[PDB]
Amino acid sequence: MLMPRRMKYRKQQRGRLKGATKGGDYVAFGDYGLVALEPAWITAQQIEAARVAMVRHFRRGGKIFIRIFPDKPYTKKPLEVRMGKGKGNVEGYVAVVKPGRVMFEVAGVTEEQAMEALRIAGHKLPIKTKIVRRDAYDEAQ
C-alpha cells in the first residue's frame, strides 16, 4: 500500500479542507480521468481498492495512473482510552483531496472499458466523483 518511505515528522496536525484543489485539475497522462467533487481525506486503503478494481476490470490490460499520494499521517488513540497523555499513534495515511482533483487516469483501453472501470472505482471512494475525458482545455494547461 502507498505511504511515504521516509518523513521529516511522524505526525501532522489535522488539515483544514477549504478551497478548490491546488493543482492536478487537468488530465495529464491518460485519456479518461476520475474527478473529485467533494473534499476528503482519501485513505491509502481507498486508493488501493479503487486501483485493484480498475485492474481486475482491465484484466491486467491498459494503463492506470494514480495522481494522488497518501502522504499525511493519520493518528488514532487506542480504544477506550481517556483524552490527553499526548497524541495517538499513526495508524494510516491519507491524501488530502479537494474538489477538482484528478485522482486517477486510464488509457490503452476502449471508451467503454474506461468509463466502467472509473465508475467502479468511484464506488470505492468516500465522495462523489465525475468521469472526464481529455479535452483541449486539458492540453492547453
Partner: protein, 154 residues
C-alpha cells in the same frame, strides 16, 4: 485550419456579469496592442475544441478588423471544469513560439516550434513498445525550428 470567432470589446462590465450572461471574459494582446474582449462562451467552445492552441483563430471584432490570433492561455475554474478566461495572442509577421501536433506514420502529442505566422503547418509527421526516439530526429518542414532541447523523448 483555420477558424473564425466573433469577439466583442469590454471595458467595465464585471466578468461575473459576463460569465452569468453566458460569455467568456478574455484579452487580446501582442507587442503593439492590448484589448479587453469577450467571446460568446458556447461559440468559443465549438471552435476551441477543434482549433485548440495549435490552429489559427481569426477574431472578427465589430470594427471590421479580422485579427488572426492563437490561443495562448485558458484559465479554468477548477471546481466546475469550465473555462473562465482566454488569452488571444494577435499574430503578426514576427516569429512566434507555438505547439504543433504530431501525427505518426507515443509520449508527445505535440511539439513547441519557433515559426513565422505564414509558415504555420498543420502536421509534423513521425515514423515507425517499448522503444522510442527523440525530437533530434524529426522532420521540420520549411520555416520551423525545434523550440526545445532535442533531449526530449517522443
Amino acid at each position: 485550419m483555420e477558424y473564425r470567432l466573433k469577439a466583442y470589446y469590454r471595458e467595465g462590465e464585471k466578468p461575473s456579469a459576463l460569465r452569468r450572461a453566458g460569455k467568456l471574459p478574455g484579452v487580446m494582446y501582442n507587442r503593439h496592442l492590448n484589448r479587453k474582449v469577450y467571446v460568446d462562451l458556447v461559440e468559443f467552445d465549438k471552435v476551441f475544441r477543434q482549433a485548440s492552441i495549435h490552429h489559427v483563430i481569426v477574431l472578427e471584432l465589430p470594427d471590421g478588423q479580422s485579427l488572426p490570433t492563437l490561443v495562448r492561455q485558458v484559465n479554468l475554474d477548477k471546481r466546475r471544469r469550465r473555462p473562465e478566461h482566454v488569452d488571444f495572442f494577435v499574430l503578426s509577421d514576427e516569429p512566434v513560439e507555438m505547439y504543433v501536433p504530431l501525427r505518426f506514420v507515443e509520449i508527445h502529442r505535440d511539439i513547441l516550434v519557433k515559426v513565422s505566422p505564414r509558415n504555420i503547418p498543420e502536421f509534423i509527421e513521425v515514423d515507425v513498445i517499448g522503444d522510442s526516439l527523440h525530437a533530434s530526429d524529426l522532420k521540420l518542414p520549411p520555416g520551423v525550428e525545434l523550440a526545445v532541447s532535442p533531449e526530449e523523448t517522443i
